[PDB]
Design a protein around this nucleic acid. Structure first.
Ligand SMILES: [Mg+2]
Ligand SMILES: [Mg+2]
Ligand SMILES: [Mg+2]
Ligand SMILES: [Mg+2]
Ligand SMILES: [Mg+2]
Ligand SMILES: [Mg+2]
Ligand SMILES: [Mg+2]
Ligand SMILES: [Mg+2]
Ligand SMILES: [Mg+2]
Ligand SMILES: [Mg+2]
Ligand SMILES: [Mg+2]
Ligand SMILES: [Mg+2]
Ligand SMILES: [Mg+2]
Lengths: 55, 143, 141, 106, 58, 78, 145, 117
RNA sequence: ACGGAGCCAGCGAGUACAACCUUGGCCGAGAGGUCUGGGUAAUCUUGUGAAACUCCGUCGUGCUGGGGAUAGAGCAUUGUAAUUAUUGCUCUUCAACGAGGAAUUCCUAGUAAGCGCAAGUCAUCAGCUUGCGUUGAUUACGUCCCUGCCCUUUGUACACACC
C-alpha cells in the first residue's frame, strides 16, 4: 500500500467518481439538481424530499 | 406612397438586391469562395457557383433590417438545415461561421451594417435607406 | 381617443393578437401587409374573413396583427381567427348590434372555427409508447 | 436619519401555496398599513421540478415509469418604502416552508 | 452561499431526509414520531416529536 | 441489381436539328404541354425538356397557365 | 436558350486518364465516374478550369479536357487548398498528393500490404478480411455477399 | 525503394529528436505529446537506451518487458525488442523503422483469433 | 435528392468550493480555437430564427446527383490515458438495397404517421428512453369469427385443476 500507488487512479469524473449518498453505489444514480441519490432510494424518500406522484 | 422592405415579398427582394450588389463592383467576395460548403450540413457548394455570396449578403442585410440586431453565431443557427448523418438520424447543424463573418464585415465596409452597442450588428441609416430604395425598385418593377 | 379594441385568436400553440382601429383600410400582419402571408397556399384562408364579409365593410378600419407561437399553418389560422374576432368585437363595441349579428351569420355559416377557438390539442405521451396513444412492438417469442 | 428610500425588494419561494400566498398577503397588508408604495405580488411561472424514474428496482417486469415533481412559486415583491418598517416586516411573519429573501437594490 | 433556487429547495428536502433518517436510526428506542425543520432569519429550529421526550432530552 | 428492365438510352441527351424541327412543328397541336408530356415522345432527355419548354416562351408559341416549380402547365397559343 | 449543338462534333465516349467515360452526363458527374474523384472534387476542378458547370461532358472541347486533366494531377499548383485533397501528408514522403484512378487503388494496396507486413492489429484484421474500425461483428457482416 | 517517413529518410530517422518527429507526427500524436507526458514513457526510454547500449553491437538486443501500451514508438526506439503485455504474455515485438507513428498495442493482440468448426 | 431563399414552437436545463449554459467580437473551410460579456435564471444562452415545410432553380427513371455501409489519408475536441477506429470535421471508394415469403406488431382524433428539440445516461459518445411541440390523415363508431376477459347455466373420472 505504497501511498504513490494505493488509490492512485484519478477519480475526477466517470461512473465511479460520485456515489449514492444513500448506499454508496455507483449504478442507477440520479444527478438531477444535485440529488446524487440512486433511483430506488429516491423512490423511497421522494415524499420526504418533496417529490410526489401527481399525474 | 412610402415603402419598406416589409411591404415587398421576400424572395424577390433578396433576388433583386443580390443582382444590384453583383452589378456594382463593391462588396468584395472573399478569395476562398467557390471552395466552401457554406455549412457542415451541406454536402456540395452552391449550385450558382459565382454570385451566391451576393445573395447571401442580400438575405443577411434584409434579416438585420427586420430583426433587432444579429451577430454571427446567430446567423449560423439561422442558415444550415439537417445534415444527412449517413445512417444516423438527421439533426440540426449550424452553418459555417467564416462565411457569415465575412458577409458581416463586407456589409460593414459598404456601410449598410453598424456595430450595435448591445452586441451583434444592427442596420445603419445609409444601408437602411438603400434597402428601402431597392424595395421600392422591386415594388414598382412588379407593376 | 381613437375608437380601438384588441382581440386575439388561437390555434394549437399559435396566438395572433389583433388591434383594430378606425383607420384607412390597413391590414398588416407582423408589420407586413396581409397579401404576403408566407405559406402562400393558405393565403386565401387569411383573406377568408375579408371576402366573406366584403372589404367595403371595413374600408376605414385598420388592422394590426402580431402572430407568435405554433407552426406556419397554426399561425395562419390564428390570424384568421384574430381578424374575424376583431371585426366582430369592434362592430359590437362601436358600430351596431345588427351589423355584428350579420357578420356572425356570415362567419359561423362558414368554417365555425372563424369565431370559435379550436378545442383539439395534443394528447400527452405515455411510457411504453413512442406516441401519445401508440405502443412498442411485442416480441412474443 | 434613514429617510433615503432603499427601493427594496422582497422575493419568496416555496413548494406549497396557501402559506406562501398567506405570507404575501400579510406582507402587502403590512405595506399598506404604514402607507407604502409597492408593486404587487407579481406571480412567477411555477417551476415544475420533475424526475422520471423506473419503478422496478431490478429491470424485470413490464416497462413502467413514474414522474415525481414539485412546483416552486416565487411571487416577488418590491417596495419604494422607508427603511426600518420594511426590515421589521421582513423579520416578522415567517412561515416554515415559504422562504423569504430580501434584496436592498439601493 | 449562492446557489440556484430550485437546487436550494432540493437540497433543503434532502437535508430534511438526512435529519429524518438519522433521527430514526438514533431515537428509535425513544418512540420517534416525526421531525419538523423551521427556518428563521437567524436560527434553524429543529422540533423533534417523539414519545419519550424526557429521555430524549436526557 | 437485377437488370430485367432492359431499358435503352431512350432519351435525346443532346438536341439535333431534325429534332429541332420536330419540337417546333408540334410545338402547337400539343394542346397540353409539360416536361413529362415533352419527354413522353422520346425526343427529349428531360433536362433539356425544361430548356425547350422555357425557350417556347419566346414568341408566345404556348401560353402559361401556372409556372409553379417542380412542373409546368402550358397550353397552345390561340 | 437552346442550340442545335453542331451535329457531328458532340462526343459520346471519352478516355480521360485511361478510363472510358460516357460524355452525355453533366461534366462533373461524368468526371465522377473515375476512381478517386467524387462529386465535390470534380465540381471544384471543373470550377477552377472555367468550363461551364451545366455543360455536357461530350460537348466540351479537347484543350478543355487537357486543362481539366492538368488541373487534377498537381492540384496545389492551381490554388486547390492543402485540405480538400485525397491523400494529405502522404506518409511515404510527406507531400500531400491526390490519388487517381489506377494510382488510388494501387497505393491503397501498398498501404494495405504495409499494414500486413507491419504486423499491426489493423493490418492483420485487414489480412483476415474482418471489420477493422472497431464495430461489433456478432450480428453484422453475417454473409460475405 | 528505401524507407522515408514523411520525407525524413531512414538515415535521418535513426539520428533525430522526438520533437522534430512530433512536428512530423500526425494530429493524434501531436496532441498527445503536446498534452504533456507521463514519467513511465521516460523510464521506458531510459531502460531501452540502456538495453541497446548493453547489446554487443551484432545481435538482437535483450527483450524489455513492459505493460505500457498507450505510448507511441518514437524515432529513438527503432532497433529495440519489447515485450508488450497482452493480458497474459509479454508478446515479443522487434521495433522496425515502420513501427513509428503507431502505439505498442497494435502488436500485442489482446484477443486470440476465433476459429469456428 | 441536391443548391440557394423563406423562417415557425413547446416541454427543459444551466457554474462553489467549482469550473455549467453560452451570447457577442476576432481567427479557421469545418470540427474547433481565442478575447471579452451576461446568467445561481420569465432577466442571460433564448423569440432555443429546430427539422419536416414553403418558393425559385439543377438533376430526369439511369442502382442515377438515391442509398452511405465498408475502407484510405489528414485536421481537431474530451480524457492520465482514444490502438480494438471515443466523438466531430475535410477529400475519395462508393457495397447490399428494385416496396421484401410464411408470419407477425401498434393504432379510431390533434390519434396513427412523418419531423425534430429538450431532459436522464454525460469528462467525450447515441441510432435509447422519458417528455415536448410542428405538419397531420385513410378507415371504423361494429362483432364474437381468431386470441382472450366478465357473469350465469350445465357436465366432469380434473384439484400439482386440460400443460
Ligand atoms: Mg436553409
Ligand atoms: Mg434522406
Ligand atoms: Mg407520434
Ligand atoms: Mg430544401
Ligand atoms: Mg419558444
Ligand atoms: Mg432552422
Ligand atoms: Mg451513387
Ligand atoms: Mg445523395
Ligand atoms: Mg425522414
Ligand atoms: Mg439504455
Ligand atoms: Mg369498440
Ligand atoms: Mg384427485
Ligand atoms: Mg391432452
Amino acid at each position: 500500500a505504497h501511498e504513490n500507488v494505493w488509490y492512485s487512479h484519478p477519480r475526477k469524473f466517470g461512473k465511479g467518481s460520485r456515489q449514492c449518498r444513500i448506499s454508496g453505489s455507483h449504478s442507477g444514480l440520479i444527478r438531477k439538481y444535485g440529488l446524487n441519490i440512486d433511483r430506488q432510494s429516491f423512490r423511497e424518500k421522494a415524499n420526504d424530499i418533496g417529490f410526489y406522484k401527481y399525474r | 406612397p412610402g415603402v419598406s422592405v416589409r411591404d415587398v415579398p421576400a424572395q424577390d427582394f433578396i433576388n433583386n438586391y443580390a443582382s444590384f450588389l453583383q452589378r456594382q463592383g463593391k462588396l468584395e467576395v472573399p478569395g476562398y469562395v467557390d471552395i466552401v460548403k457554406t455549412s457542415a450540413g451541406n454536402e456540395l457548394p452552391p449550385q450558382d457557383s459565382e454570385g451566391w455570396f451576393y445573395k447571401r449578403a442580400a438575405s443577411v442585410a434584409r434579416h438585420i433590417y427586420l430583426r433587432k440586431q444579429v451577430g454571427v453565431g446567430k446567423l449560423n443557427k439561422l442558415y444550415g438545415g439537417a445534415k444527412n448523418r449517413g445512417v444516423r438520424p438527421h439533426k440540426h447543424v449550424d452553418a459555417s461561421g467564416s462565411i457569415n463573418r465575412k458577409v458581416l464585415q463586407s456589409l460593414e465596409k459598404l456601410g449598410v451594417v453598424e456595430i450595435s452597442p448591445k452586441g451583434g450588428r444592427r442596420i445603419s441609416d445609409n444601408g437602411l435607406r438603400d434597402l428601402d430604395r431597392i424595395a421600392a425598385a422591386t415594388l414598382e418593377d412588379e407593376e | 381617443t381613437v375608437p380601438s379594441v384588441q382581440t386575439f385568436g388561437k390555434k394549437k400553440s399559435a396566438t395572433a393578437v389583433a388591434h383594430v382601429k378606425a383607420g384607412k383600410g390597413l391590414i398588416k400582419v407582423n408589420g407586413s401587409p396581409i397579401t404576403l402571408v408566407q405559406p402562400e397556399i393558405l393565403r386565401f384562408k387569411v383573406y377568408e374573413p375579408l371576402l366573406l364579409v366584403g372589404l367595403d365593410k371595413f374600408a376605414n378600419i385598420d388592422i394590426r396583427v402580431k402572430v407568435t407561437g405554433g407552426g406556419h399553418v397554426s399561425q395562419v389560422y390564428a390570424i384568421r381567427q384574430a381578424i374575424a374576432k376583431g371585426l366582430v368585437a369592434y362592430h359590437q363595441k362601436f358600430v351596431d348590434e345588427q351589423s355584428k349579428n350579420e357578420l356572425k351569420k356570415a362567419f359561423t355559416s362558414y368554417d365555425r372555427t372563424l369565431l370559435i377557438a379550436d378545442s383539439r390539442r395534443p394528447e400527452p405521451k405515455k411510457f411504453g409508447g413512442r406516441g401519445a396513444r401508440s405502443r412498442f412492438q411485442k416480441s412474443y417469442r | 436619519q434613514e429617510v433615503v428610500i432603499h427601493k427594496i425588494r422582497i422575493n419568496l419561494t416555496s413548494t406549497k401555496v396557501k402559506q406562501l400566498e398567506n405570507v404575501s398577503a400579510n406582507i402587502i397588508k403590512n405595506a399598506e398599513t404604514f402607507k407604502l408604495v409597492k408593486k404587487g405580488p407579481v406571480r412567477l411561472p411555477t417551476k415544475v421540478l420533475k424526475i422520471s424514474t423506473r419503478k422496478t428496482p431490478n429491470g424485470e417486469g413490464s416497462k413502467t415509469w413514474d414522474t415525481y415533481e414539485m412546483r416552486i412559486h416565487k411571487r416577488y415583491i418590491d417596495l419604494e418604502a422607508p427603511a426600518h418598517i420594511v426590515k421589521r416586516i421582513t423579520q416578522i411573519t415567517i412561515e416554515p416552508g415559504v422562504d423569504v429573501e430580501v434584496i436592498i437594490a439601493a | 452561499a449562492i446557489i440556484s433556487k430550485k437546487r436550494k429547495l432540493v437540497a433543503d428536502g434532502v437535508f430534511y431526509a438526512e435529519l429524518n433518517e438519522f433521527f430514526t436510526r438514533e431515537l428509535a428506542e425513544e418512540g420517534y414520531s416525526g421531525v419538523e425543520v423551521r427556518v428563521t432569519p437567524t436560527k434553524t429550529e429543529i422540533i423533534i416529536r417523539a414519545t419519550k421526550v424526557q429521555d430524549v432530552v436526557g | 441489381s437485377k437488370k430485367s428492365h432492359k431499358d435503352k438510352a431512350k432519351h435525346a441527351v443532346v438536341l439535333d436539328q431534325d429534332k429541332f424541327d420536330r419540337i417546333m412543328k408540334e410545338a402547337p397541336t400539343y394542346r397540353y404541354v409539360s416536361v413529362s408530356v415533352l419527354v413522353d415522345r422520346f425526343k427529349l432527355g428531360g433536362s433539356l425538356a425544361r430548356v425547350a419548354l422555357r425557350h417556347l416562351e419566346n414568341e408566345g408559341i404556348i401560353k402559361p397557365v401556372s409556372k409553379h416549380s417542380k412542373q409546368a402547365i402550358y397550353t397552345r397559343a390561340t | 436558350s437552346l442550340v442545335v449543338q453542331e451535329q457531328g462534333s458532340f462526343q459520346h465516349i471519352l478516355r480521360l486518364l485511361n478510363t472510358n467515360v460516357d460524355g452525355n452526363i453533366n461534366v462533373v458527374y461524368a468526371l465522377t465516374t473515375i476512381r478517386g474523384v467524387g462529386r465535390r472534387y470534380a465540381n471544384l476542378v471543373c470550377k477552377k478550369a472555367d468550363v461551364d458547370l451545366h455543360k455536357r461532358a461530350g460537348e466540351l472541347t479537347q484543350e478543355e479536357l487537357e486543362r481539366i486533366v492538368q488541373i487534377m494531377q498537381n492540384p496545389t499548383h492551381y490554388k486547390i487548398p492543402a485540405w480538400f485533397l485525397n491523400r494529405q501528408k502522404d506518409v511515404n514522403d510527406g507531400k500531400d498528393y491526390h490519388s487517381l484512378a489506377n494510382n488510388l487503388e494501387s497505393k491503397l494496396r501498398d498501404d494495405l500490404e504495409r499494414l500486413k507486413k507491419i504486423r499491426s492489429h489493423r493490418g492483420i484484421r485487414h489480412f483476415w478480411g474482418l471489420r477493422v474500425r472497431g464495430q461489433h461483428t456478432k450480428t453484422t457482416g453475417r454473409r460475405r455477399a | 525503394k528505401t524507407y522515408s517517413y514523411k520525407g525524413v529518410d531512414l538515415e535521418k530517422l535513426l539520428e533525430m529528436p522526438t520533437e522534430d518527429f512530433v512536428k512530423l507526427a500526425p494530429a493524434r500524436v501531436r496532441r498527445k505529446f503536446a498534452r504533456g507526458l507521463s514519467e513511465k514513457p521516460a523510464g521506458l526510454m531510459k531502460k531501452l537506451r540502456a538495453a541497446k547500449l548493453s547489446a554487443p553491437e551484432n545481435e538482437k538486443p535483450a527483450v524489455v518487458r513492459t505493460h505500457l501500451r498507450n505510448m507511441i514508438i518514437v524515432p529513438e526506439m527503432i532497433g529495440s525488442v519489447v515485450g508488450v503485455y497482452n493480458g497474459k504474455v509479454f508478446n515479443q515485438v522487434e521495433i522496425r523503422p515502420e513501427m513509428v507513428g503507431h502505439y505498442l498495442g497494435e502488436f500485442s493482440i489482446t484477443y486470440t483469433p476465433v476459429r469456428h468448426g
